Structure formats: C-alpha cells, structure tokens
Design a protein around this ligand. Structure first.
Ligand SMILES: Nc1ncnc2c1ncn2[C@@H]1O[C@H](COP(=O)(O)OP(=O)(O)NP(=O)(O)O)[C@@H](O)[C@H]1O
Ligand SMILES: [Cl-]
Ligand SMILES: [Cl-]
Ligand SMILES: [Mg+2]
Length: 282
C-alpha cells in the first residue's frame, strides 16, 4: 500500500524520467535525530554530491500503530508544497523493510535547540520567527492544509537562519470537511481538541500563540506537572505573563490564545500586528 501521490523519480541536482530512487544513490552520514519510527540521517546524493536529509521509517513499526494513512498524508501534502519557509520533500522511495523520505537539509538545526541554549528569545528574534512561520502557515492555509503540530521541535533553520516548517506527520487537507482528531503535542494542544469539539485551521493560530509565549518566556504557557493538570489549564486558558513581557507581545499572545477559535485573528492580522511590524526583521 506504499504507493503515494508523490515523486519517486531520480532528480538531477545539477541541471534544472525513468530511473527511480534507490538507497544506492545516497552516501549516509551521521544521524540528525531520532523520530517516532526511525532516525533521520544526513545524506549526500552520489552523482551531484548534493547534501540533503534522509528520513528512514521502518514498515514494521508503522503498522503496529496503524499510521500508514497519516504517512500518506505527510508525504503527499509536503511534496506538493513550494515555499521558502517550508521544508522541501523532494521525493520518497521504499524497499522490503523501510520507507525513505528525501527531505531538504536544514543546516542550523532546530529552533528547539536554539531555545535550549538561549533559554529565551529576544523580541526581534521572536517576531522574525513568527513572521516567517505565519508566512508559511498562510501558504499552507491557502491550500486548505492544517499543520496541527506546531512546536519548536518541528521548526528548522535554513542556511540564513530563516525558519522552515517541518514534520507534516499530523497535517491534513481539510478544504471544507472540518476535522475531529485529537492529535499533536500536549503543551501545544488547542482547547477544541481537549474538549472534543470539531476543529478547523484555527488550531495553527493557537499553537502560534503558545509558541510565541515559549519563545519569550522559555516555557509554554500552560505547562503543568501532569497531563491531567495541563488539560485543565488549556481548557481554562489559564496562563500569566512574567513582568518582562512587553504590552505589544502581551497583546498578540492574548489575541491568539482565545478559547473561541473564531475570535483568534487571521494570519494577515498577525503579520500586520504592531508588535510584529515593530520588531520583525522580515
Ligand atoms: N532536515 C533536517 N535537518 C536537520 N535535522 C533534521 C531534519 N529532519 C529531521 N531532523 C531531526 O529530526 C528530529 C525530528 O525527526 P522526526 O522523525 O520528524 O521526529 P518525529 O517522529 O516526527 N517527532 P519529533 O522528533 O518531535 O519532531 C528533529 O528534531 C531534528 O533533530
Ligand atoms: Cl535578537
Ligand atoms: Cl505549578
Ligand atoms: Mg513525524
């Protein structure tokens, strides 16, 4: 069933067909990280010496959890996207045991690692990330695609330090049929998923507000000691700002963290926000 609506043809990374991708086309390097069902390796295409990232998923693990359909959604959606702030999925291929994803290589790693080293981000670095993320989110929503898994671990950094969305393992194409699945990461779950209501593209707006908070504070706003307490604080929208948070950021985060999904602003309003337009570098 590993036949996706996504490229699997060999790509000549030196110009501008018939042969398909194969593991013999790539030199493998150190692993960039471990995933849900397999590591992600730094790789190099042999003919062009082009550096990219190879995400390996073992077919045996995906069937124990029954996530073959979400992998189909991940590969088919991401491979048809073209945006500077979105990680490229050049193609895929598979053998008897594994499924391979030929991903764009982000040289500067994850935003998550930059946040661990700097503890918290300044306002300019935050506003620029939010602008780059909202731009890529607006491109996704223009194709009726909801990411539904916005978190620092899924935000990578390109050559110029620009932000690029990664990991579409929970994304979905919802043109009008609005979805129902409880999915994502705990601290970034929107209220409509915890309370069992049907959600739309406004869940990326909520996770954007949670992300802007953690960028400035260093901890997500609804962080708790258990899943039990985190569920309540997200449902109540129970969070407070430290004193060093400015009124401009205090306004944007509060606008994005509305319990009512319809009251959360549009991505254009986030891009035109006074706090953004004042501190964003892009
Ligand atoms: N193109 C890339 N460049 C550099 N590192 C990457 C790249 N793709 C993935 N990684 C690394 O792999 C990690 C995530 O891999 P992935 O297989 O998507 O995990 P996951 O199972 O989807 N869940 P999560 O690890 O939380 O994102 C990132 O945090 C990076 O450390
Ligand atoms: Cl800065
Ligand atoms: Cl506490
Ligand atoms: Mg994934």
């Amino acid at each position: 069933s590993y036949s996706y609506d996504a490229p699997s043809d060999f790509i000549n990374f030196s110009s501008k067909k018939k042969r398909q991708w194969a593991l013999e086309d790539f030199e493998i390097g150190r692993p960039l990280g471990k995933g849900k069902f397999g590591n992600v390796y730094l790789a190099r295409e042999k003919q062009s010496k082009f550096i990219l990232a190879l995400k390996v998923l073992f077919k045996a693990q995906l069937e124990k959890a029954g996530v073959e359909h979400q992998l189909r959604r991940e590969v088919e959606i991401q491979s048809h996207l073209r945006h500077p702030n979105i990680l490229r999925l050049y193609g895929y291929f598979h053998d008897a045991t594994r499924v391979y994803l030929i991903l764009e290589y982000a040289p500067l790693g994850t935003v998550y690692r930059e946040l661990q080293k700097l503890s918290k981000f300044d306002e300019q670095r935050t506003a620029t990330y939010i602008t780059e993320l909202a731009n890529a989110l607006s491109y996704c929503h223009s194709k009726r695609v909801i990411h539904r898994d916005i978190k620092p671990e899924n935000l990578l950094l390109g050559s110029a330090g620009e932000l690029k969305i990664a990991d579409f393992g929970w994304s979905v194409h919802a043109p009008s049929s609005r979805r129902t699945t409880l999915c994502g990461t705990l601290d970034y779950l929107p209220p409509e998923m915890i309370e069992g209501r049907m959600h739309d593209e406004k869940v990326d707006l909520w996770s954007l507000g949670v992300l802007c908070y953690e960028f400035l504070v260093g901890k997500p706003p609804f962080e708790a000691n258990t899943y039990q307490e985190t569920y309540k604080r997200i449902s109540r929208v129970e969070f407070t700002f430290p004193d060093f948070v400015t009124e401009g950021a205090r306004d944007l985060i509060s606008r994005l963290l509305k319990h009512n999904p319809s009251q959360r602003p549009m991505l254009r309003e986030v891009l035109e926000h006074p706090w953004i337009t004042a501190n964003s570098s892009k």
